Amino acid sequence: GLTRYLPISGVSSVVALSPYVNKTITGDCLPILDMETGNIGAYVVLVDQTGNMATRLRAAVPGWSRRTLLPETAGNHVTPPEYPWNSLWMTPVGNMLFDQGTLVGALDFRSLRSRHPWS
Amino acid sequence: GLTRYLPISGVSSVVALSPYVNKTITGDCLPILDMETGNIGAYVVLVDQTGNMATRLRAAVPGWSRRTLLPETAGNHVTPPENSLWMTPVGNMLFDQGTLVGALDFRSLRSRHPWS
Amino acid sequence: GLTRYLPISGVSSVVALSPYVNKTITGDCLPILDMETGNIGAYVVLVDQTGNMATRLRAAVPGWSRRTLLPETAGNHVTPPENSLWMTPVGNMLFDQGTLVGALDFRSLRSRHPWS
Amino acid sequence: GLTRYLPISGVSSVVALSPYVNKTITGDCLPILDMETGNIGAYVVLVDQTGNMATRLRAAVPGWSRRTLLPETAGNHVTPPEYPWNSLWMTPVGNMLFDQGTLVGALDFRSLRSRHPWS
Ligand SMILES: [Cl-]
Ligand SMILES: [Cl-]
């Protein structure tokens, strides 16, 4: 398969390892800490208020609802593939398998019809 | 305690739920997907090549090293408060309810970010 | 759907929430711990050395291979219903709400267990 | 460090890779499927009805409450280590760290004061 996905604890979400290089983006930023160094090599950037991460954050941080300037929806998406059975299905990207624990998708994410802030 | 942290599978990295509102940054973007929908409301922005996220990406996508324009290091980091393997960059943290909670508000620590 | 499945970190293995009540088995026991308490109410029982759990254990505990008395294989397995990389041993499964749910009741499939 | 721990999806629980060899044990058994083969190389065995796994199972399987013969508590445990600060703490076993994503404990589990069905 191609694209790999990293589950995030405490939310029904995954980091898709399909990079879009050298883009600029605006929103509410959550630091990602490297635990062994304390370096911050990456940030989670929320661009609207609907999603599992938004829900979790509202619960973790009750002022954020009132402080944020984000839209409720900003429009970004991937178009979920059509159904084919006997498969392992993840709605936004389709067929999956487990490889020594890691989530691997059959398709490359970059190749589904998606829209992001830089489009 | 005052700050919650979500571990990311496959890396020694946590999402600090300590918002910095309406900032702009540049880097390599990874969609965060929800299992239930194609709607995307968040991305991971990598800002250097030495972070654990960068490192996991290279293993997964061998060609990304050639295309990225990120520096090896950006001076973004968090400093803990006033043997070393077992310490944390933010101070005391505890596993609870599927996540981690720490004893301090992240915002109270010394932290440098791209908007500094 | 009728059966829920919990992935186990680091292995291509799932816990089928399809109980078989009051059975007795023999094998190598691993405590399952809750983050909030020292109370233990469940264990993983390995029953062979070729399962993914066995394999992860060897990497973590090099001396356990010499001490275990388990066979290489026990004929416990599940058969799916009436290209091959993308299939599942139980049929259709979907990611939902942090776990997996399948379209069948596990108990309805052909399965051999130590109590067979 | 020594003992390694495997988070289980959907519950605040972990498999402790500290084996107790060739023991016999009774209870309600959940198969553990190898996804790439369909082999069942291991079973989860519940020995009482209190715990995060019991809770999740009650929600997944509402007949189980009425069908099970387990006690509410069977007594098994590990004695949580005493507190020392700046550490990463997991109540039942103490100091932890992350190693390329994996949970590693400072102690060997087998060396805390614990009790199990075979004791
Ligand atoms: Cl990889
Ligand atoms: Cl290991």
Side-chain angles (χ1 to χ4, degrees), chain A residues 76-95:
Chain A
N76 309 285
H77 65 270
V78 49
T79 302
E82 246 143 9
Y83 301 107
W85 206 264
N86 179 333
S87 83
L88 173 67
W89 202 252
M90 184 156 92
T91 291
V93 310
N95 290 283

Side-chain angles (χ1 to χ4, degrees), chain B residues 88-105:
Chain B
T88 271
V90 297
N92 296 316
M93 294 192 296
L94 176 68
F95 286 99
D96 174 74
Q97 290 312 318
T99 55
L100 287 165
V101 56
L104 314 171
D105 205 305

Side-chain angles (χ1 to χ4, degrees), chain C residues 56 59-60, chain D residues 4:
Chain C
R56 179 77 187 78
Chain D
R4 272 138 183 98

